[PDB]
Amino acid sequence: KRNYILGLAIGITSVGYGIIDYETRDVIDAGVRLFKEANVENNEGRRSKRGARRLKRRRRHRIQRVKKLLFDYNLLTDHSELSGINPYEARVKGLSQKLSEEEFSAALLHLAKRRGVHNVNEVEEDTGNELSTKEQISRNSKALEEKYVAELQLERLKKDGEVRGSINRFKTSDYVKEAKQLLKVQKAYHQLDQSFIDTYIDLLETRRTYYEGPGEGSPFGWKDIKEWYEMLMGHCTYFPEELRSVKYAYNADLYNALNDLNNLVITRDENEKLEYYEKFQIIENVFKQKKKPTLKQIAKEILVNEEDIKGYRVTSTGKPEFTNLKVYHDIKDITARKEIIENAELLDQIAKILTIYQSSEDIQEELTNLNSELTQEEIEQISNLKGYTGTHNLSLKAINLILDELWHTNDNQIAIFNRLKLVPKKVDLSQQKEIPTTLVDDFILSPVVKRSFIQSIKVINAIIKKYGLPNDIIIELARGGSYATRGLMNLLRSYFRVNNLDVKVKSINGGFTSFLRRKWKFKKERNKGYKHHAEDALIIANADFIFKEHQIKHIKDFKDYKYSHRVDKKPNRELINDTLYSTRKDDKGNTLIVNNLNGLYDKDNDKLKKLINKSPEKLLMYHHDPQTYQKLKLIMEQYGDEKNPLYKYYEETGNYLTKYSKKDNGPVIKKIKYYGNKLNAHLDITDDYPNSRNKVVKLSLKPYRFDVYLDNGVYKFVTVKNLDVIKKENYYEVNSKCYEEAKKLKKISNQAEFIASFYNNDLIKINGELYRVIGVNNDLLNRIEVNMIDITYREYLENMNDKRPPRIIKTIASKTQSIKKYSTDILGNLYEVKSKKHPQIIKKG
RNA sequence: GAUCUGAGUCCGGUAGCGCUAGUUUUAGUACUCUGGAAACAGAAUCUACUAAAACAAGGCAAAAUGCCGUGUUUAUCUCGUCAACUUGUUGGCGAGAU
DNA sequence: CAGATCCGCTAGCGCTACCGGACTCAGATCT
DNA sequence: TAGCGGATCTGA
């Protein structure tokens, strides 16, 4: 309808937008789009977890396979009990002496339990004494050439009293050697075939390789290593369809050499290009003779002085180096025969196999599959070859055409490609009115910048739909430098050009932006709010106005900012905290969680003394076996003013605090249990633990959403936890039984139906005040955590400068008058919304 | 100044494979009382060590052996179409609601 | 009963493949 | 990775 200049202030957590009229030169509308910062830590934690689960599942499956092996030979049965057997003593006995089949099974299962590290027996480094594994097992291996793993572990068990810890890391080769000696001794007495020993040793020593990955039933798996490398490697810079060539292919190295030789500038020829018959001679007398060509040796072939040579690439003060064909010389040494050397395609295939396949056994198999001329011995020699990794940026076909052209003409690669006329094509389809959001995914960015760009693209789409095609689009960026910015503008320019509705896209300069902000008065203070980002976008468009066209600016006084917050309705997230707590019934009859008090001998840690001063009965050692408590409390009161008597007592005696003993042999105490506050909100894990005397729970269960119900005037509130959502087929469905049960506790009438359903960062209007919901604080206490939409509560309190903690909790009780649900579009327009009836299905994909 | 190419260093990712640990329970041993006027273990379950087994709730798979589960996108409603393996949720157009 | 105050939340390495960026150098084309 | 899930505790 009306032309305008649109400013954008892309941040990590915010995309502020500002729309300034081209004619009146004043703001039409400005707003902010708030979203939680994308963090590499989130996905790295998810992947770290996925890997830990696979590790734990792999270990359990290996234990189960070992158990099946023991069953098939009747060594271990369901009637036998591993319990009561010390596996360390059993292993040390088995290395030299016969042992029973149940104790044999105990030793074998313990060996299969801990296998040792494989990454270190390949590469091990040692520097004195350190908290590293590569050095710890260095020291252990020093202690191993004398004795096996089990004997050293048992010796440590007698010396320090314990085996487990950082001291207990060893190599898989040591474990395999010990197990092999154990099995060699044991196979005489027991009925064990050779095949059983090899099967067990594979179970002990076998792990997946990094190129083999999970089972191909996984979404993360791959059928073959060739396909694994195919999806891994990039695509050609000119031919998107074509995959990159491996950088040590013979044609790629020839291409690089030809490129170098064309950069050569010779004066005696009075021309800048080198001759063809001369370049071929150089390449056939220097590059094919030396592993690394030398410019001085090139001077001999060119028959001209070195200072006449110019244009060679050089790195700092080093010699002028040229790109050399390592594959050609490597094949040349192992194979003197010239049919392999002559056939460049053979070197290309050999280099591709060497780069693709990570194992030497795989390389030999695929070299045999090549059915080439050279005999199997040279196949083994190539298999032993190493140093081939990475990919050349160009594809093999592009390299072939380019080198065929480079043999004759001395033009650089860009000129040859321009004469080859490959014209870039814009990836956007243009058949969608909105900017495609897939382009941001296409570009490689930091996760924070990628999410900010997606939000910015949707903001641009909404503005174009609401107001019309911008006259100009103007962008800033907080993170990513100017590189990500230029990618965003390449996207936007490509879309506008291909769709023929071209709009200028410009990024105002950071120095010029600072100059503009310094001009006049734009005060920046702490606790400004998101209106700060909105004002920055307005100032960005303001900067553009100065460049192309400051009196009576509406930017000075504009209390019309609209704040849009992203709503997170994504199911299946972190359900519950990973810590497992033990509970204990008190005298009264309430279930109390048990908390351990760690770091007793720490100067900074003074909790143990506070817990004694508050109430000593909270300590479990006061109630049970009180004499060590009385000794500890004598130590406690003796120091008094000292903040942590435990560390001081240990320092004076030289040893940590030990539990009371008349023989003075009592064990040292590292942690102390005390009684915690009673818990109502918990998840029972006690079923996992048979015959558990006391109930063991996980805590802090995360809510998904809460539905506000209204019966007979009083407002109710039902919480749907992340544990109540379960996945089937392609979708997520909340549990009907769990929802009905949770409705029973809140005792909502059957005739009542709910006002609305609230997800995280959803707008709610309680008693005429509108805040966005953070989450339900207490399900039983009927309180929900909220936050102010325009400014975060912490910043508002900091301006308010009060003592009260920055946290607002609202109670949905019998006294609240109204509850309303509001939604804002991405632009920030706020709407009262109508609710559906009881959402129990959410789609995935 | 910005694309392209290739020599390096230095950071950041995405996936994969493993290591030792951590929380908890059970069992055993130590240690704590008790008969003990003797043998024996009755309690206590606090403090350590060792083992096995459970670690986001769970869901698949059949053991001819293995896989998934903590991220990425997402304002709400009606409207006639079109899938989903045919009821309520989702591809797309319209329309409301500040 | 309504805020305020108090209190916890798994962890270190150790490799691998391929993708990206900044830099600095030697030369291409575009603006 | 500093916000979230909660329990206590004073007013009473």
Q: Is the CB of A699 under 7 A from strand D?
A: yes
Q: Which nucleotide is nearest to A667 (CA to C1')?
A: B48
Residue A23 to residue A548: CA distance in whole angstroms: 12
Residue A353 to residue A340: CA distance in whole angstroms: 15
Neighbours of A681 (CB within 10 A): 14
- Closest residue by Cα to residue A109 from A200, A206, A191: A200
Q: Is the CB of A129 under 7 A from strand C?
A: no
| Cβ pair A826, A564 in contact under 8 A | yes
How many Å from the CA of A804 to C1' of C2?
Answer: 14
Tokens 């749907």 belong to which residue? Answer: A720
How many Å from the CA of A708 to C1' of B75?
Answer: 18
How many Å from the CA of A836 to C1' of B79?
Answer: 15
Q: Which nucleotide is nearest to A134 (CA to C1')?
A: C14
How many Å from the CA of A816 to C1' of C1?
Answer: 13
How many Å from the CA of A675 to C1' of B64?
Answer: 53
A306: Cβ contacts below 8 Å, ≥ 6 apart: A295, A296, A299
3-class SS at A717?
A: strand
Which bases of chain B are contacted by protein, using any atom under 7 A from a CB? 2-8, 12-28, 30-33, 44-58, 63, 65-78, 84-85, 88-91, 93, 97-98
Neighbours of A495 (CB within 10 A): 25
Q: How far is CA A230 from CA A221, A289, A395, A619, in A?
A: 13, 34, 13, 61
- Closest residue by Cα to residue A641 from A613, A679, A672, A601: A613
Please tell me what resolution, in angstroms, this structure has.
3.0
3-class SS at A21?
A: strand
Count Cβ atoms within 10 A of the Cβ of residue A74 and give its class: 0-12 exposed, 13-18 middle, 19 or more buried: exposed
- The pair of structure tokens assigned to A786 is 């909220």
**CATH placement of domain A4-25+436-565:** 3.30.420.10
Count Cβ atoms within 10 A of the Cβ of residue A555 and give its class: 0-12 exposed, 13-18 middle, 19 or more buried: buried
Q: Is the CB of A781 under 7 A from strand D?
A: yes
**Dihedral, CA atoms, A33, A39, A42, A44, nearest 10 degrees?**
150
SS (H, E, C) A578-641: CCEEEEEECCCCCEEEEEEECCCCCCCCCHHHHHHHHCHHHEHHHHCCHHHHHHHHHHHHHHCC
Q: Is the CB of A785 under 7 A from strand D?
A: yes
- The pair of structure tokens assigned to A678 is 């009673």
A265: Cβ contacts below 8 Å, ≥ 6 apart: A272, A309, A310, A311
Q: Which nucleotide is nearest to A823 (CA to C1')?
A: B75
- The pair of structure tokens assigned to A459 is 């903001």
* Entry field: residues in chain A: 845
How many Å from the CA of A272 to C1' of C23?
Answer: 31
Strand positions, DSSP E, A455-598: 472-477, 504-506, 562-565, 580-585, 591-597
Q: Which nucleotide is nearest to A781 (CA to C1')?
A: D6
- A373-377 long-range contacts (CB < 8 A, ≥24 apart) are A373/A337, A373/A339, A373/A340, A373/A346, A374/A335, A374/A337, A374/A340
Q: Which nucleotide is nearest to A246 (CA to C1')?
A: C18
Neighbours of A33 (CB within 10 A): 30
| Cβ pair A755, A781 in contact under 8 A | no
- Closest residue by Cα to residue A629 from A615, A641, A640: A615
How many Å from the CA of A42 to C1' of B96?
Answer: 39
Residue A66 to residue A274: CA distance in whole angstroms: 69
Tokens 């009260």 belong to which residue? Answer: A804
Core vs surface per residue A624-662: b (16+ CB within 10 A) or e? eeeebbebbbebbeebeeeebbbbbbbeeeeeebebbee
| Alpha helices (H) along A307-437 | 326-334, 338-342, 344-356, 360-370, 376-384, 396-406, 413-419
Q: Which nucleotide is nearest to A412 (CA to C1')?
A: C28
User: Domains of chain A: which residue ranges?
Assistant: 4-25+436-565, 74-191, 239-419, 580-697, 701-843
| Cβ pair A115, A121 in contact under 8 A | no
Which bases of chain C are contacted by protein, using any atom under 7 A from a CB? 1-22, 24-30
Cα A674 to its chain centre, rounded Å, is 37
Residue A279's identity, in one-letter code, is K
Q: Is the CB of A814 under 7 A from strand D?
A: no
Q: Is the CB of A40 under 7 A from strand D?
A: no
Q: Is the CB of A499 under 7 A from strand D?
A: no
- Closest residue by Cα to residue A321 from A291, A294, A283, A285: A294
Residue A816 to residue A793: CA distance in whole angstroms: 21
Residue A361 to residue A47: CA distance in whole angstroms: 30
- Closest residue by Cα to residue A309 from A276, A256, A260, A253: A260
How many Å from the CA of A359 to C1' of B72?
Answer: 34
- Closest residue by Cα to residue A657 from A672, A668, A643: A668
Closest residue to B2 (CA, C1′): A486
Q: Is the CB of A804 under 7 A from strand C?
A: yes
Bridge partner list, A823: A831
A268: Cβ contacts below 8 Å, ≥ 6 apart: A304, A308
Q: Which nucleotide is nearest to A13 (CA to C1')?
A: D3
| Cβ pair A20, A4 in contact under 8 A | yes
Residue A760 to residue A295: CA distance in whole angstroms: 67
How many Å from the CA of A210 to C1' of B15?
Answer: 10
In the sheet with A27-34, reading across from the earlier edge strand, the strands are A504-506, A472-477, A4-10, A15-21, A27-34, A562-565
Q: Which nucleotide is nearest to A783 (CA to C1')?
A: D6
A814: Cβ contacts below 8 Å, ≥ 6 apart: A714, A715
How many Å from the CA of A242 to C1' of C28?
Answer: 23
Q: Which nucleotide is nearest to A761 (CA to C1')?
A: B75
Q: Which nucleotide is nearest to A774 (CA to C1')?
A: D4
Residue A157 to residue A180: CA distance in whole angstroms: 23
Residue A554 to residue A26: CA distance in whole angstroms: 6
3-class SS at A722?
A: coil
